CSV table of C-alpha atoms (C1' of nucleotides) and ligand atoms in Angstrom, one decimal:
chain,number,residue,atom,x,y,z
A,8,UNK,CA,0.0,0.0,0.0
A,9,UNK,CA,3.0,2.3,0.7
A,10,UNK,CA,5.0,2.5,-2.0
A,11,UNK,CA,9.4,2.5,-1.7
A,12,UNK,CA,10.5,5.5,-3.1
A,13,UNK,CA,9.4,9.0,-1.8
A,14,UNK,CA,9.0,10.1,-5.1
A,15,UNK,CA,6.0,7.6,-5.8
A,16,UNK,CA,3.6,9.0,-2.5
A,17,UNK,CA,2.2,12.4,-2.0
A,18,UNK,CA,4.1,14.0,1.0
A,19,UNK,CA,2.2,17.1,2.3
A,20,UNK,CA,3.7,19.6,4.6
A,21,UNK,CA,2.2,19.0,7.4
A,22,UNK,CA,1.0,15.5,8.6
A,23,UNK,CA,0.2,12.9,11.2
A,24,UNK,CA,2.9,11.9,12.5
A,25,UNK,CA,5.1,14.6,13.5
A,26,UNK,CA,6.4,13.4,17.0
A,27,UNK,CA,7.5,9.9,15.3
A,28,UNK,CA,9.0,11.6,12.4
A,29,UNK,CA,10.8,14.5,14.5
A,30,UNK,CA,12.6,11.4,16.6
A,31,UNK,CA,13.9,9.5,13.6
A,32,UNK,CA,15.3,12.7,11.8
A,33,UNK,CA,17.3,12.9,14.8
A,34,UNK,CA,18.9,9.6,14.4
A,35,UNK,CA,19.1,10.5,10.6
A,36,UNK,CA,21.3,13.9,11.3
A,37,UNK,CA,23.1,12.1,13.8
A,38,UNK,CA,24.3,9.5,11.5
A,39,UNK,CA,25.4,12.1,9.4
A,40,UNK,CA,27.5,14.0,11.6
A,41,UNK,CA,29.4,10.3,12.0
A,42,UNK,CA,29.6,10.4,8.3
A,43,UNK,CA,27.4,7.2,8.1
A,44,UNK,CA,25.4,8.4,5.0
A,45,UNK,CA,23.7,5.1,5.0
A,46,UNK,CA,21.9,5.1,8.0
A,47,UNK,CA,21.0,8.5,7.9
A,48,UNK,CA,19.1,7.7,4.1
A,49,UNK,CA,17.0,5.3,6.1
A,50,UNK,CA,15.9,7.4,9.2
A,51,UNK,CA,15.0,9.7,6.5
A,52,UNK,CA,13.1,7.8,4.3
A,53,UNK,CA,11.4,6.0,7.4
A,54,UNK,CA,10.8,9.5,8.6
A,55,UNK,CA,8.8,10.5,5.2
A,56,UNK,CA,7.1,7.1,5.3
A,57,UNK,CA,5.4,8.7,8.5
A,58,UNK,CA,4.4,12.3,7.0
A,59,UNK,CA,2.6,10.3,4.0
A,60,UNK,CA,0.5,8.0,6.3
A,61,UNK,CA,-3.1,9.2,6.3
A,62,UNK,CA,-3.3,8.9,10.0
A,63,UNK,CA,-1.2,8.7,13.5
A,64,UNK,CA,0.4,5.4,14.0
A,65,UNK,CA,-1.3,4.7,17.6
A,66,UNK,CA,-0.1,0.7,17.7
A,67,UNK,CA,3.3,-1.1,16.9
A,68,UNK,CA,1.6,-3.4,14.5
A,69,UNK,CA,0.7,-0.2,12.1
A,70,UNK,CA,4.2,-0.1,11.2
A,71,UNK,CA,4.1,-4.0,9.5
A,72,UNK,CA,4.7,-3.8,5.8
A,73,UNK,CA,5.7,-0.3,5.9
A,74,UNK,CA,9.0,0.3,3.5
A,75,UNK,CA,12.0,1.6,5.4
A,76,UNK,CA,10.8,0.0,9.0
A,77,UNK,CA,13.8,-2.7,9.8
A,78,UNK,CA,14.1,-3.5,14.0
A,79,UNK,CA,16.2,-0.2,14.8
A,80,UNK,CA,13.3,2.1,13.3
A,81,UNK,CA,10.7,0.2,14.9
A,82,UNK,CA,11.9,0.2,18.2
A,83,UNK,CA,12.1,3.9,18.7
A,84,UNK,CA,8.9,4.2,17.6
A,85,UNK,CA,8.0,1.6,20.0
A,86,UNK,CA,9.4,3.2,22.5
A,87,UNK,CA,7.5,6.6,21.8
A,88,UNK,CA,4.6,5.4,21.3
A,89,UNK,CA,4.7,3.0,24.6
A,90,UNK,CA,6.4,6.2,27.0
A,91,UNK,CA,6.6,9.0,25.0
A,92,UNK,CA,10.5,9.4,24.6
A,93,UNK,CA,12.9,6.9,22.8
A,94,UNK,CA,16.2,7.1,25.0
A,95,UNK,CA,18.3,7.2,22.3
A,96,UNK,CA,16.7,9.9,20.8
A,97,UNK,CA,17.2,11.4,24.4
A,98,UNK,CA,20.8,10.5,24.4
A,99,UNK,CA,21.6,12.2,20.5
A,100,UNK,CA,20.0,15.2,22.0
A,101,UNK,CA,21.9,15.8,24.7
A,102,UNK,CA,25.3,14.7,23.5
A,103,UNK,CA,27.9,17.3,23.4
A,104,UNK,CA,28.7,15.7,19.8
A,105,UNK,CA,25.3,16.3,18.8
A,106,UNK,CA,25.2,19.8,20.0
A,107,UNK,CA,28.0,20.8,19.0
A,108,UNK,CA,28.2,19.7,15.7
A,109,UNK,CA,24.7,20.6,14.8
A,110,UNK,CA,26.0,24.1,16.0
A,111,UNK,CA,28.8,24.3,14.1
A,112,UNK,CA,27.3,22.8,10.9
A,113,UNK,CA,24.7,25.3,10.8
A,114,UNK,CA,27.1,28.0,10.4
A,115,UNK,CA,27.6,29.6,6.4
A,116,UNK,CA,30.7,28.0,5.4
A,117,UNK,CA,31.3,24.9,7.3
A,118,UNK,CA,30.4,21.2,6.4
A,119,UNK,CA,30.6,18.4,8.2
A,120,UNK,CA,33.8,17.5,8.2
A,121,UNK,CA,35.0,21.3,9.2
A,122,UNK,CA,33.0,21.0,12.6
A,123,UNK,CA,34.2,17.3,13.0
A,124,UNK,CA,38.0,18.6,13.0
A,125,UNK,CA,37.0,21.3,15.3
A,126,UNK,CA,35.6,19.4,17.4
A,127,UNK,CA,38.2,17.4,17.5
A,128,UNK,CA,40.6,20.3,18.5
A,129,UNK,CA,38.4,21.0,21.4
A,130,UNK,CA,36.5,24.1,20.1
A,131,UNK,CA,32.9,24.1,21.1
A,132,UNK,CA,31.6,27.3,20.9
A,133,UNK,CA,30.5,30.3,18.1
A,134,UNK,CA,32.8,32.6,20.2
A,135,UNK,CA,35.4,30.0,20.2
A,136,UNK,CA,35.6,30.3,16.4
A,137,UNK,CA,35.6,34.1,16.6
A,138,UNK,CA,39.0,33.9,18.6
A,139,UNK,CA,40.9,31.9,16.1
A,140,UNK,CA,39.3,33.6,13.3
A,141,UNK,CA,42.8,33.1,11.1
A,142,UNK,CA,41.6,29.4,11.0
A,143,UNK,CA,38.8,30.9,9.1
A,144,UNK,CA,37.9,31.2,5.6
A,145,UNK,CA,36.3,34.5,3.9
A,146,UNK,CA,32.9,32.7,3.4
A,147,UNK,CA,33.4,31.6,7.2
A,148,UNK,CA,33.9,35.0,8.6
A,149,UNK,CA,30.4,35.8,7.2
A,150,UNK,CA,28.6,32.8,8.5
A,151,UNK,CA,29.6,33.6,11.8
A,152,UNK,CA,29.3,37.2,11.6
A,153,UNK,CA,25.8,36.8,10.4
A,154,UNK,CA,24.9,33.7,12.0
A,155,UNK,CA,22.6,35.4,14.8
A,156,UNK,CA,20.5,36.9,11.9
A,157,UNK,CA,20.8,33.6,9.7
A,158,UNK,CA,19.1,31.3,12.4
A,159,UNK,CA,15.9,33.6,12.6
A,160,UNK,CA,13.1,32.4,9.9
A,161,UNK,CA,12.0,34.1,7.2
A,162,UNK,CA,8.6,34.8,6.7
A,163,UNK,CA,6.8,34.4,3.2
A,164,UNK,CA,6.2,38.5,3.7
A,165,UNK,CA,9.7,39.0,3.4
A,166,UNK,CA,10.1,37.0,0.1
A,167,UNK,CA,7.6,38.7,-1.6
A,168,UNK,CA,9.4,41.7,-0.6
A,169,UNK,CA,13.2,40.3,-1.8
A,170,UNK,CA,11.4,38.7,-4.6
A,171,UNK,CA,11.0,42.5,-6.3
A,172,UNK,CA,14.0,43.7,-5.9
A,173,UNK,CA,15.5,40.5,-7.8
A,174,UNK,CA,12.9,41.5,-9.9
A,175,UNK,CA,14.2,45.1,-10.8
A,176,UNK,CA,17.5,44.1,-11.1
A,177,UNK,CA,17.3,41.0,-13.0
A,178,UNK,CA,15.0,43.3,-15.7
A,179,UNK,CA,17.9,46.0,-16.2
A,180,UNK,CA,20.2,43.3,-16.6
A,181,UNK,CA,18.3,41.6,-19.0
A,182,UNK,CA,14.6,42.8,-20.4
A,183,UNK,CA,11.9,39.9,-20.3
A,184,UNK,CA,14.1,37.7,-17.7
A,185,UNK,CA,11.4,36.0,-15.4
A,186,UNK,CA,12.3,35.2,-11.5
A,187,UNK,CA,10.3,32.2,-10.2
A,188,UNK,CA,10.4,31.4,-6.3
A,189,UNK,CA,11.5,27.4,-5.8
A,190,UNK,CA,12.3,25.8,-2.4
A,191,UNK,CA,10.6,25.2,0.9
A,192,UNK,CA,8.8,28.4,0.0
A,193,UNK,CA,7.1,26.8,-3.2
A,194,UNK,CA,6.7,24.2,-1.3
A,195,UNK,CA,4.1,25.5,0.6
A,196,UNK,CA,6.3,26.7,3.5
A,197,UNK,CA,5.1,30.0,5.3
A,198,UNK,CA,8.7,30.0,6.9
A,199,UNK,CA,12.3,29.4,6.1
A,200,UNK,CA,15.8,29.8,6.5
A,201,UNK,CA,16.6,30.9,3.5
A,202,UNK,CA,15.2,31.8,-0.2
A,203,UNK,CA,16.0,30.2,-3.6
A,204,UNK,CA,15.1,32.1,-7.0
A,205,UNK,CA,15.4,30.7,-10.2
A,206,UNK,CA,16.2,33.0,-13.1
A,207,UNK,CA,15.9,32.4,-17.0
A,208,UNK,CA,14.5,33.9,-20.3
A,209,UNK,CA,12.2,32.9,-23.0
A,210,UNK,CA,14.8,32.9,-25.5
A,211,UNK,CA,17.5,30.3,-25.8
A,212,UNK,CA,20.8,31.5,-25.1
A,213,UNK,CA,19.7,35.3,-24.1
A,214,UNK,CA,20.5,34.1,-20.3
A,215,UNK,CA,24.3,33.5,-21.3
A,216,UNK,CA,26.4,35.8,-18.6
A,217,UNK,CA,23.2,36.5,-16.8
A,218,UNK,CA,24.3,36.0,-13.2
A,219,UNK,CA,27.1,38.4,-13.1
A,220,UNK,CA,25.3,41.1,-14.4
A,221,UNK,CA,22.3,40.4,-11.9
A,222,UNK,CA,25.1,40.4,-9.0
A,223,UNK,CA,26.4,43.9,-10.0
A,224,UNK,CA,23.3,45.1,-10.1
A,225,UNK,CA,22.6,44.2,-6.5
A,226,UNK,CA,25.6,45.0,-4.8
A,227,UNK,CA,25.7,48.1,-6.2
A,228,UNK,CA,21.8,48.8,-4.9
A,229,UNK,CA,23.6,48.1,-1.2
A,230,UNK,CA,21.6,44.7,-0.9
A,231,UNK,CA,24.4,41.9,-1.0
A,232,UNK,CA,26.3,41.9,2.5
A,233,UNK,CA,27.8,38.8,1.2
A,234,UNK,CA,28.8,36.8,-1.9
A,235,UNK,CA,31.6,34.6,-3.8
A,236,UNK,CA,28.9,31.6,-13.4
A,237,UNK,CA,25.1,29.7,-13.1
A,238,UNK,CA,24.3,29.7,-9.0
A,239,UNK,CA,25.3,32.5,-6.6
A,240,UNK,CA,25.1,31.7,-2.6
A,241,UNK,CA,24.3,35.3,-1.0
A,242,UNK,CA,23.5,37.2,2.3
A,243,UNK,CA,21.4,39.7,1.0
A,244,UNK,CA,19.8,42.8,3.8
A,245,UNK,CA,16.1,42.4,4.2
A,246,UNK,CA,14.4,45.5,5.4
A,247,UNK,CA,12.5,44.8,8.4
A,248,UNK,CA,11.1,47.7,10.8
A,249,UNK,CA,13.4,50.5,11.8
A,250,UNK,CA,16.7,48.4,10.6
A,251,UNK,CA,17.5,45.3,8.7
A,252,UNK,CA,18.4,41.8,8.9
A,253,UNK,CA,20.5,39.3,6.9
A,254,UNK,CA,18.7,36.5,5.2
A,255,UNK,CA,20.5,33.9,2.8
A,256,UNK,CA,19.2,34.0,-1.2
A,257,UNK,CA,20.3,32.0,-3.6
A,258,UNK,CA,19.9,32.5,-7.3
A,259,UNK,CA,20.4,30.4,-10.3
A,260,UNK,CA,20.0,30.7,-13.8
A,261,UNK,CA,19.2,28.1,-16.0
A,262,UNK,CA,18.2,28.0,-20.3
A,263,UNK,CA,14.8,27.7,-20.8
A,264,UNK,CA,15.6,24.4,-22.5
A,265,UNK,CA,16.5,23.4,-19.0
A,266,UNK,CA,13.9,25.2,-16.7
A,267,UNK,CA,11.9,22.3,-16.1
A,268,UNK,CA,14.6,20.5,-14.7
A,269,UNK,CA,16.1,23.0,-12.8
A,270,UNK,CA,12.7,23.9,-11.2
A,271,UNK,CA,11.8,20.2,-10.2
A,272,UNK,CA,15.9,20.5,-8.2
A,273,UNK,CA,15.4,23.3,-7.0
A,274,UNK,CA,11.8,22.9,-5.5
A,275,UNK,CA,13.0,20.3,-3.6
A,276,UNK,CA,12.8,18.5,-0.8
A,277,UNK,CA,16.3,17.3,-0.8
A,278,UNK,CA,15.0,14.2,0.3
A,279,UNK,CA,12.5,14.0,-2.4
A,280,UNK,CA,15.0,14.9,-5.0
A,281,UNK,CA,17.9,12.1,-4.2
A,282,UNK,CA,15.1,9.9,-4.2
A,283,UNK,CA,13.8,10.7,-7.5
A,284,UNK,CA,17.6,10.7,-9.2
A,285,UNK,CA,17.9,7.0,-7.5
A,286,UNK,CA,14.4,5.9,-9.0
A,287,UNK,CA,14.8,7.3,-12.1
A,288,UNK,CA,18.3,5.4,-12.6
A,289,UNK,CA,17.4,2.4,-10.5
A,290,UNK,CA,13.9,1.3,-12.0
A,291,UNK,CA,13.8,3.4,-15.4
A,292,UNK,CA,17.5,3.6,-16.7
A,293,UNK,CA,17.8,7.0,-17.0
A,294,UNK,CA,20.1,9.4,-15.5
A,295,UNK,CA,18.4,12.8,-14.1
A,296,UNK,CA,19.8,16.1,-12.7
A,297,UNK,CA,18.9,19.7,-12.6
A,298,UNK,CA,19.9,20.6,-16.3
A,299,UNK,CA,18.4,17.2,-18.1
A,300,UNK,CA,17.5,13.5,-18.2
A,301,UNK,CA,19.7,11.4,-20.5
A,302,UNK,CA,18.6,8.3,-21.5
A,303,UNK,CA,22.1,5.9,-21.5
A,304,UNK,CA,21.8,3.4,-24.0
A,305,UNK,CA,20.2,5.5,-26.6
A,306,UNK,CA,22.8,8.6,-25.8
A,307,UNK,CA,19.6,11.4,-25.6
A,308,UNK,CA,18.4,13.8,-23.5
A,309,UNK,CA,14.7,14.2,-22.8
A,310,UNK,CA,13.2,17.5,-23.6
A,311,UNK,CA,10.7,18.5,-21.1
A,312,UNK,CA,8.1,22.0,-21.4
A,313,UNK,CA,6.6,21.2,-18.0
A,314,UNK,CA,7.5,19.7,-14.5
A,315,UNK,CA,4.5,17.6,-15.7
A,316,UNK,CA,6.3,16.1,-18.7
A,317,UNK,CA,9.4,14.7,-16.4
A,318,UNK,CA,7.1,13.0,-14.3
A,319,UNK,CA,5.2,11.8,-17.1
A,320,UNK,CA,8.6,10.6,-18.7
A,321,UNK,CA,9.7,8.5,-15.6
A,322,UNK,CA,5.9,6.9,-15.4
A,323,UNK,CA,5.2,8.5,-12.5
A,324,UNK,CA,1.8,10.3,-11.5
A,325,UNK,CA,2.6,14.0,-11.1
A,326,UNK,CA,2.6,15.3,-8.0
A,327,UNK,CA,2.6,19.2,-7.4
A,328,UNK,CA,5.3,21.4,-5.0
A,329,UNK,CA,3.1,21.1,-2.1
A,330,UNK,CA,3.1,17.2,-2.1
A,331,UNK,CA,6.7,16.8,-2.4
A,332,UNK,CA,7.7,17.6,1.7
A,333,UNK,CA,9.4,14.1,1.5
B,7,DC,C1',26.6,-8.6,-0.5
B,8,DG,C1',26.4,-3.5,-3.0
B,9,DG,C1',24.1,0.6,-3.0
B,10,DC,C1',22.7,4.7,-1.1
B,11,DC,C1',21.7,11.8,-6.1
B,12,DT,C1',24.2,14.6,-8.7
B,13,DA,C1',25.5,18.6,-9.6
B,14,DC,C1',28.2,23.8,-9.3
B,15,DG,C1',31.5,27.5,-6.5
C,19,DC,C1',36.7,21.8,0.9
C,20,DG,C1',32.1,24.5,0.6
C,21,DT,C1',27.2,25.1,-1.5
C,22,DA,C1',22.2,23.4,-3.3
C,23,DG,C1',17.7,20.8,-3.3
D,27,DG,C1',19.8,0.9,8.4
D,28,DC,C1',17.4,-1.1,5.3
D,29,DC,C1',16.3,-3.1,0.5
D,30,DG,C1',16.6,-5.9,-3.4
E,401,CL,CL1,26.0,4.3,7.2
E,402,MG,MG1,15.8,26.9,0.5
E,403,MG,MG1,18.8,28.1,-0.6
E,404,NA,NA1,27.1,24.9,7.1
DNA sequence: CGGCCTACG
DNA sequence: CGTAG
DNA sequence: GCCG
């Protein structure tokens, strides 16, 4: 009844089974900051099994059948649903590993392997980075600057708002380029942590050297407080009452030969995506990213007009932005 | 057992 | 190495 | 950690 790949089941924002789900995407970011990237594909995908149920789990025996639920899953959901905590879970949480490398991951700049290495020097703390800050790269120094501002939502208000100024300068750089929102924020989301824009234009090849001209058009408009071509990772100032904060934007361009495919990427969820790229080579043969779908054997790439027509071409019933919180 | 998404900056 | 979804 |  459930089938195995996200991509396959409607996933709506909000759900069911949010307690259960919470709990294993503990264990999943957990296994990441180990570097297992295994396990933490299976506490995710037995995390989005949850969101697409139809109803709470109330009874062990719900979970029978369901993809993605081996002994481990099931037992802290056992555990929850017999005493309303899983001690493991309890255990991740509290861990200085787990506290400290969520920190430190969460900071503009640095991975996982940059916060393993520091905490295995001993640094714990934001303000322990700020006293070493030759240990620090450029893009670094503005994470941690601006990491107060950075772990504040924004609000769907606030995109609207970026969303014009993009706007203005993405139409002096280039007359008749569009600006589509993608993301969590497509998705449905009335929050997030950051903003994603996808650029292009109606006529092939006109979006050639886009980006750079969109950039200089912003940072000289006093709007980018930080950036590093097709994708651009910035800290842009968002007005907001009285003053300002920093919020991260990203913007990519893609030809409109590609759009389709960018926009499915980009719209996310990152766990819906990876497990679209693994159906689409696993059960259909074919090899998808955010610029195309090649099919192997016969060397071509698909052409797609519509998100609609890359579902259609990987047999799969379409399912729109909002059903894709995997 | 092998596999686990696939890119760009 | 970082970034993205 | 789980699937095929
Ligand atoms: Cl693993
Ligand atoms: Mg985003
Ligand atoms: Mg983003
Ligand atoms: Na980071």
């Amino acid at each position: 009844w459930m089938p195995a790949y996200a991509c396959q089941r409607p996933t709506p924002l909000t759900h069911h089974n949010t307690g259960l789900s919470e709990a294993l995407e503990i264990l999943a970011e957990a296994a990441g900051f180990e570097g297992s990237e295994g396990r933490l594909l299976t506490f995710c995908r037995a995390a989005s099994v949850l969101k697409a149920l139809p109803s709470p789990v109330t009874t062990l025996s719900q979970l029978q059948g369901l993809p993605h639920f081996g002994e481990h899953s099931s037992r802290v959901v056992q555990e929850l649903l017999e005493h309303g905590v899983c001690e493991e879970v309890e255990r991740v949480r509290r861990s200085e590993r787990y506290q400290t490398m969520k920190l430190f991951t969460q900071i503009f700049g640095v991975g996982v392997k940059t916060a393993d290495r520091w905490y295995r020097e001993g640094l714990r703390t934001l303000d322990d980075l700020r006293e070493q800050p030759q240990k620090l790269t450029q893009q670094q120094k503005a994470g941690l600057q601006h990491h107060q501002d950075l772990s504040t939502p924004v609000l769907r208000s606030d995109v609207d708002a970026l969303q014009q100024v993009v706007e203005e300068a993405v139409g002096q750089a280039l007359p008749g380029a569009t600006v589509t929102l993608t993301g969590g924020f497509r998705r449905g989301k009335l929050q997030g942590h950051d903003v994603d824009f996808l650029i292009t234009h109606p006529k092939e090849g006109q979006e050639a050297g886009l980006l750079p001209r969109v950039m200089c058009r912003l940072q000289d408009q006093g709007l980018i407080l930080y950036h590093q071509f097709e994708r651009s990772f910035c800290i842009f100032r968002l007005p907001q009452p009285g003053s300002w904060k920093a919020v991260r934007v990203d913007l990519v361009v893609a030809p409109v030969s590609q759009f389709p495919f960018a926009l499915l990427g980009w719209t996310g969820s990152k766990l819906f995506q990876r497990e679209l790229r693994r159906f689409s080579r696993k059960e259909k043969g074919l090899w998808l990213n955010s610029h195309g779908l090649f099919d192997p054997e016969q060397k071509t790439f698909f052409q797609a007009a519509s998100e609609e027509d890359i579902f259609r071409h990987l047999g799969l019933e379409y399912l729109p932005p909002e059903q894709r919180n995997a």
